[model samples]
Target: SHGLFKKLGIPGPTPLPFLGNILSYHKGFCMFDMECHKKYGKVWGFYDGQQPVLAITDPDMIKTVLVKECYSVFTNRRPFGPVGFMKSAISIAEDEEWKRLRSLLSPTFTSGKLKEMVPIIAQYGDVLVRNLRREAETGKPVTLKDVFGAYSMDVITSTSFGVNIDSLNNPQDPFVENTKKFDFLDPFFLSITVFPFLIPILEVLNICVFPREVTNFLRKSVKRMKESRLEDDFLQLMIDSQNKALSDLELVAQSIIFIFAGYETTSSVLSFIMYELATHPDVQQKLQEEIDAVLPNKAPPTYDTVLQMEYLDMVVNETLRLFPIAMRLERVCKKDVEINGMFIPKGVVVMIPSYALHRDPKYWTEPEKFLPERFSKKNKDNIDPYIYTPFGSGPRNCIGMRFALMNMKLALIRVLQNFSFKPCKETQIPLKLSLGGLLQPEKPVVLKVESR
Candidate 1:
């Protein structure tokens, strides 16, 4: 392969011609990212096929890229390599289009709107406990991923529309089934990732990432909502915004992105927290005590009460630090520009590996160990914001951050009030994590749920 990094004077691992460093990901990108940072220091380059990705860990450079120069230097993400439907979602939209959609949707997630959705989220939190109680009563270990996933699905379903479906009880429901049809590892996706140049050709062929049935299912749901005008929710708010500014397809795209963005990411974090609690008894007990003190009557947690639990906040933050929903934050360099003595050509992807940054020994003490105190009032200020961005940094950070945090905190409170987690035979010691995808236990997190 020709030396793109050579011209820029950035050093990195040697990559094969067409495949680039993609094969390295067979072991998982998190480990690969860590290894690269370990070898190359703060800045390095690698290839995802022909695309030259520059990975940056330097704080000032990262700040400039993500915050200061975000508007001009790095505005949009790597272009979507799939179908067009997602192009309408805020996550994939670019430039002026992105600005319009972001402005319109930002208010939808404000505290006032979230307050209206709180009752809806709390209702599902109760459902989560009710369902887990049955499993606890069975004296059997529960697969937390599926359990929390069902709860997340229910929450998204209700909060997205007024319709209610019990995914916890009926995992076979159409919504769950259709959502599963979106196979991230489909050969088509892998092909596009390796040979992104094929995307335009594939688009001409009308290739799609989401299955037809899944798209149809979401479209039908939106149509049903339009006809019925369901309760106050995210979708209804979008529809109400600007009163017909957005078309039907645009509304469906937003809904799909909500479920896609919110579902597994929230569930994975919840599951990771459970695994940590089960393994660390002291931490679990301390968290339970905080919950009890805050809500002595063991009642459903309100937004104000959930926010007040400082220790719970620390635990959530620590877990997210260790197991961020998105392993790497990415932005495509808009126009050719230079920052902090590094020349970045236009269209080169700039990556910040949050997972590696979180565990960098230089920044974290005994980086392998889990220490919620690192986020405590006194210590957190000492920690650099650039090094600990699980929800990411700057203007384009995860929009659903508050919503996801509330979901996790509310569910944890409701569950901890009734049950305590214990390590069981099936629990993986040292927690073998999956190679790629979202950070998750290699095995389903099977933990004994004891009725307190």
Candidate 2:
């Protein structure tokens, strides 16, 4: 359904008959979205093929769009067809179901459950350090993204599905192999995702955006786990939620979303944090000092202890600011709404380009610099809250935020306790990020590992 952006005074790259601005994002989303702001001002429009999407950059408008008032109206994410069973996952669930699923699933991400999973993460953090330590010993450049990605898969899979998959050690684990093969940002994948109109046609012809093998592996793995019936772990929580009436079909869908979403994004982010630490030694030193004072004895880090480490928090915050996981966030306008004197007709996609806002000159002094102190207690209040929403804002913000923060803290503590990452010939300086999925290194994030 092609719409009239010109009628609404929204400006963006002109869309082609069939492709829209899809080709524009081919160079990279970072540049494409940044340029949109440069040319069209804070509020503009872009075509996802023929569909009109409103791109809003003003923080106040962003606050208005993401808050609870807009919650009922803007609950659904833009549909990407039936993504295996990803369509049923909370991330893309339609209104009533989204609320129900969110309420049902909230406790799984609770601090109590997260604390219970700390040992799972700790065990895998050890694997990560050993993995990095091997590269340090070899004095060879290591691709940190793949390295840490496997670690996250190992940790998250152990807790979520109640399975132990050390993809870092056992490369062929189906759990590990599946996550790598499904590219969320491939051009072919992107086209189908944005303009899902053709999806039904493709589906009728038996085409798939997500690989069948990955889907098969996920369905079978979840079924196998459900039959065994794990106790008190994440899977048990999902299975037992909603008065124990949750269907196996629904349960399998939740597992796929939870595992894939948690796995890749956390992996990308933790690796980006390491990249910053590698390049910015002084910030790394400050973080290690705080880690030493708070977690000096190689004690299995408690949630309370990790939460108290202020410097580490700042470093992670800064890294997330520069390299946000979801990149561009969007919500659909459920009913006709007006904000900033602009009209948003019903069913319009309200796009929030976090990657641009985080780096906008208006909000940050030196937006490109990796200065963690900006997040320190003394300086944090200087920036606007809405401008720095790495996990998004309001009730719909990322549910796994607490778990991710703890996971990153624990893993970072383990690695910094032993070694430091340094730029080598292979390190992608001024990193070339992926045009899709979470913004991550396009090339291997090769860095030198040195034993401290």
Candidate 3:
């Protein structure tokens, strides 16, 4: 009766003693957030064991915590045991380090910097279209997960480190090979998920959360780039900014973080958008029409071109809404804060159930339906900004949002230009989410494709 949530007078599902509400969390992050929203009201508190965590699906509550310009008490994420390079990253850095790192890395992803990187992205799109074409001709079941995964890997590597190699070109590329060895579903992470307090304990035991091989590859790759004469790549920007602002190791950490954050989110988006285009023929047709008009004669899209295609932006926005790769976003309170009359202690973790917000009847007209036009120019004003965050919200939202959008748009343009995805027998209807990792289909997203 005296659980932390109840003591705070917050409404939430009853949590079991010791274990708290850990079991109530579903495997898919989106699903867990959904259940929490359905069971609890808009703003409710749940316990992560003895630890108090607030799950807020309401956009207004989200803005108070993550977007209040003067109230700077909500910048850090809940400590999820940052180990090795992750601790040194901007993502995991706290206070001074976070500010400094963000200042240096911020310039690298700006409109001008990213505009310079469009050719780099477009070249990879060419490679992706080539790979897709070969697969289309085979007339065999093709999974967008593998196809886009490899493509995204290539893009991230090239842009991140100036590595001029395509992932599909060599099946045994070190980065490509290392990706297969991830153990996201292992017992260690599972245990940590339930009892998050284990984070510091595990960190004290020197247990690396990420696969050793994966971390090792990142370390070596950064070293290799640092030693060599490099071109104007993502790594170069950081390196150029690296005189006294950051150590060589810190730069390596940032590089690794960029490679990963850059890789997973982009790949998931491409895979989901392509699958949605496959399943919803009318949406796909309309998207193709926009692509056809913009990319006439298969002209590789430039940065401006991506921004010009209004429907393309809407389709991607809708795709992010329907299947956001990053489902849950959290910010830990820096100081004791009050929203209305409720006092949230400094140490409490607050989460925004973005998946629930995107699908809630309050925000979206038909929660389950695929409707890109909801984000159309004339209709966008009807929706609230905080309610539709796929890449997160506020000052500390995804720093790579612009960079991600540019690449995603280019990939979609290239793919949708010459090929059309149609549903196949291997395709799973109402795609199921994976037990772990980013929001991915439980079954591989298979589709039949035809040359345009």
Candidate 4:
């Protein structure tokens, strides 16, 4: 046993013989990972029914696992029971299947392709502004979190699925509800997967981690899309590359995953950016100046305008660096490997705690502070490339990184140009992370929107 368990000279928590640490770990995915890191230092060992697991936090080690030894140490994504529908999707597929899907879909997210979608993104931002103005006029409190979520949902749905879901106007839309259902399954689903033996039993008992209605909505939406002969780029690409006819379930799985990936993460980024701007009016003023300088008149902020907003880009990058949507990166060793004099065995889980890494004093000066200037070209060039990965690194990194950045920039550009955000009494200080959903402020983040 030259693996982490043996190398670290530590045995995992005692299990019920066959049960292992599955039950304990299942209770909370984020909490469990955090606890393990707290007790185990940068590298520690755990077990899932005698399956030795190692949780490593070192950036270089993560690079080895995710990059140099990706094929050997990391294969396709390990499926969780809740996201079972995604088994056939590109995110979970391996080998040639993954290759085919990745190749086909990569073109859709290229800069050129995203340029075409920028007008759609800008349109949603305008709709968002109009809705917010209406809310402001009513003298009612606005939930920035919900508003941003709806805004992002519309943007992602329109761009990815080629369907215009005006969630900003109608928050109770079925698509919005369906998307929300997938938010809470992370903790519950991860637990079941940690204990693989229980998965079969759970599945047999007709147990589903995701809400039934959410699953049904996804399936129906896919079916409707399939029945139609829409010529949208995303749909056309799927239709052309799908070797065989995609099942309703398969289509639903991909669509929902795309929406989840596209919407929630970007929304979180934008929300935090707004929070940072509110707290730092000087920064907000400077950013506003940049936006105004670029757009000049009140013309709709387009892709070209967003691209030229270098300061805004820095701000977004800085926000992502501080509060990434996924605070941690999980990987399992594909083969035995040694890094930094530590031997890691295959099948061992590695957790790269990006939050801790990003804030580590060794890599960043005043890492806890929100400073967009750090991301300037000169400073960004000086930092360790491996230490900064808000969207992740390597070939398996976020596929929609460019598109997400562009969308966030466009939304912020339009919003900031029209309104200045200031912290209102309802705005939460020391933002608390939501324990259940995708990483979001625990409470509704309220900000005063004054006409700029």
For all predicted structures, in order, the TM-scores are: 0.96, 0.93, 0.94, 0.87
How far residue 287's Cα lies from its native spot in candidate 2, in Å, is 1.3
lDDT-superior candidate, 1 or 4: 1
RMSD of each: 1.8, 2.4, 2.3, 3.6
What is the full ranking by lDDT, best candidate first? Answer: 1, 3, 2, 4
Model 2 TM-score is: 0.93
For each candidate, what is the lDDT? 0.84, 0.78, 0.79, 0.71
Residue-by-residue lDDT tens digits, candidate 4, 26-142: 433455665665666667666655566666667677787667766666655444563345556777677566666677677778888888887777788888888888877666666
Model 1: how far residue 347 lies from native, Å? 1.5
The residue pairs that clash in candidate 2, if any, are none
User: Model 1 over residues 1-452: C-alpha lDDT tens digits?
Assistant: 43788678999888888878777777677899999999999899998877889999989999999999999978888877666576788888887788788888888889888877888899888888888889988887899988899888888888887668888778787577886443233465568777778888867776666666788888987888787764438888898885827778888988888987778888888989998888889999999999999899896788899999999999999988888767889999988888988789987999999999988999999887888899899997898999889888887888888898888888899999999998889788789778755477788888999888
* lDDT at 42, model 3: 73
Best by TM-score: 1
Please give the TM-score that candidate 3 achieves against the real structure.
0.94
Using TM-score, rank the candidates from best to worst: 1, 3, 2, 4
Writing each residue's lDDT as its tens digit, candidate 2 over 335-427 gives 887776667898788889888888987778899998888988999888787778888888788988898888878889888888877888877
Candidate 2, after superposition: displacement of residue 151 in Å? 1.1
What alpha-carbon RMSD in Å does predicted model 1 have with respect to the real structure?
1.8
Q: How many residue pairs clash in each candidate?
A: 0, 0, 0, 3
Give the CA lDDT, 0 to 100, for residue 156 in model 2.
71
